[PDB]
Design an enzyme around this catalytic site. Structure first.
Site, PDB file in Angstrom:
ATOM      1  N   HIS A   1       0.718  -1.271   0.000  1.00 45.68           N
ATOM      2  CA  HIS A   1       0.000   0.000   0.000  1.00 45.68           C
ATOM      3  C   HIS A   1       0.748   1.324   0.000  1.00 45.68           C
ATOM      4  O   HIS A   1       0.114   2.377  -0.049  1.00 45.68           O
ATOM      5  CB  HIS A   1      -0.968  -0.011   1.180  1.00 45.68           C
TER       6      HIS A   1
ATOM      7  N   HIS B   1      -2.938  -3.262   7.664  1.00 47.65           N
ATOM      8  CA  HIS B   1      -4.002  -3.562   6.707  1.00 47.65           C
ATOM      9  C   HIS B   1      -4.703  -2.284   6.265  1.00 47.65           C
ATOM     10  O   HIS B   1      -4.916  -1.375   7.062  1.00 47.65           O
ATOM     11  CB  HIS B   1      -5.007  -4.534   7.347  1.00 47.65           C
ATOM     12  N   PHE B   2      -5.039  -2.215   4.980  1.00 43.65           N
ATOM     13  CA  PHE B   2      -5.739  -1.057   4.441  1.00 43.65           C
ATOM     14  C   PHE B   2      -7.206  -1.465   4.416  1.00 43.65           C
ATOM     15  O   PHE B   2      -7.576  -2.393   3.707  1.00 43.65           O
ATOM     16  CB  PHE B   2      -5.261  -0.756   3.020  1.00 43.65           C
ATOM     17  N   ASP B   3      -8.042  -0.784   5.192  1.00 47.90           N
ATOM     18  CA  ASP B   3      -9.450  -1.147   5.256  1.00 47.90           C
ATOM     19  C   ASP B   3     -10.330  -0.475   4.212  1.00 47.90           C
ATOM     20  O   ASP B   3     -11.178  -1.130   3.599  1.00 47.90           O
ATOM     21  CB  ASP B   3      -9.985  -0.858   6.660  1.00 47.90           C
TER      22      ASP B   3
ATOM     23  N   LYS C   1      -4.947  -9.823  -7.475  1.00 44.78           N
ATOM     24  CA  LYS C   1      -5.607  -9.232  -6.320  1.00 44.78           C
ATOM     25  C   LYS C   1      -6.659  -8.294  -6.897  1.00 44.78           C
ATOM     26  O   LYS C   1      -6.333  -7.344  -7.608  1.00 44.78           O
ATOM     27  CB  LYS C   1      -4.616  -8.452  -5.454  1.00 44.78           C
TER      28      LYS C   1
HETATM   29  O1  LIG Z   1     -10.252   0.441  -0.862  1.00 47.94           O
HETATM   30  C1  LIG Z   1      -9.756  -0.669  -0.674  1.00 47.94           C
HETATM   31  C2  LIG Z   1     -10.452  -1.830  -0.215  1.00 47.94           C
HETATM   32  C3  LIG Z   1      -9.786  -2.977  -0.030  1.00 47.94           C
HETATM   33  N1  LIG Z   1      -8.431  -3.099  -0.258  1.00 47.94           N
HETATM   34  C4  LIG Z   1      -7.725  -4.369  -0.016  1.00 47.94           C
HETATM   35  O2  LIG Z   1      -8.478  -5.422  -0.584  1.00 47.94           O
HETATM   36  C5  LIG Z   1      -8.370  -6.608   0.251  1.00 47.94           C
HETATM   37  C6  LIG Z   1      -9.760  -7.097   0.596  1.00 47.94           C
HETATM   38  O3  LIG Z   1     -10.477  -6.093   1.339  1.00 47.94           O
HETATM   39  C7  LIG Z   1      -7.490  -6.224   1.439  1.00 47.94           C
HETATM   40  O4  LIG Z   1      -6.143  -6.630   1.228  1.00 47.94           O
HETATM   41  P1  LIG Z   1      -5.407  -7.545   2.328  1.00 47.94           P
HETATM   42  O5  LIG Z   1      -6.353  -8.734   2.413  1.00 47.94           O
HETATM   43  O6  LIG Z   1      -4.042  -7.885   1.755  1.00 47.94           O
HETATM   44  O7  LIG Z   1      -5.340  -6.736   3.617  1.00 47.94           O
HETATM   45  C8  LIG Z   1      -7.592  -4.702   1.468  1.00 47.94           C
HETATM   46  O8  LIG Z   1      -6.443  -4.077   1.999  1.00 47.94           O
HETATM   47  C9  LIG Z   1      -7.688  -2.016  -0.716  1.00 47.94           C
HETATM   48  O9  LIG Z   1      -6.484  -2.072  -0.937  1.00 47.94           O
HETATM   49  N2  LIG Z   1      -8.405  -0.857  -0.898  1.00 47.94           N
END
Ligand SMILES: O=c1ccn([C@@H]2O[C@H](CO)[C@@H](OP(=O)(O)O)[C@H]2O)c(=O)[nH]1
Length: 124
Positions: free
Chosen positions: A12, A119-121, A41
């Site tokens: 991120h 983590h990016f929510d 992804k």
């Molecule tokens: O605006 C958003 C929403 C979701 N995610 C990412 O999409 C995945 C499912 O929600 C997550 O990645 P992780 O599982 O590796 O933490 C979240 O960080 C983003 O990058 N941006």
């Protein structure tokens, strides 16, 4: 030996560019940051602010995480970001993405000591 904090930085963070993400940005970045190795992804956001500014969010507005946990924080100021969304015709391993720049508040989950983003929510 990549920590959760390091993973968050790899997935991120992209401070370098003052956001001028071309239409090719996500196609190149999602690949360069190894986010399309096992699968494409679906959605991934890159933040263009400094690491210090993003890390600082862990001390900002405490908000509920989408998963119900309580360790999420929303930035008081808006931040320059780039959202990457897999296209409909995208087919692994040739992952294709739409690149969209924005200036919004980010919400990250924080853990550990030091307390940093892991983590990016979401962006709001
Ligand atoms: O605006 C958003 C929403 C979701 N995610 C990412 O999409 C995945 C499912 O929600 C997550 O990645 P992780 O599982 O590796 O933490 C979240 O960080 C983003 O990058 N941006």
């Amino acid at each position: 030996k990549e920590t959760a904090a390091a993973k968050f930085e790899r997935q991120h963070m992209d401070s370098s560019t003052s956001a001028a993400s071309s239409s090719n940005y996500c196609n190149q970045m999602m690949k360069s940051r190894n986010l399309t190795k096992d699968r494409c992804k679906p959605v991934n956001t890159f933040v263009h602010e400094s690491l210090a500014d993003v890390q600082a969010v862990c001390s900002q507005k405490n908000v509920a995480c989408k998963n119900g946990q309580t360790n999420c924080y929303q930035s008081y100021s808006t931040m320059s970001i780039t959202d990457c969304r897999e296209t409909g015709s995208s087919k692994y391993p040739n992952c294709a993405y739409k690149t969209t720049q924005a200036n919004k508040h980010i919400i990250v989950a924080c853990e550990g000591n030091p307390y940093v983003p892991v983590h990016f929510d979401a962006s709001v």
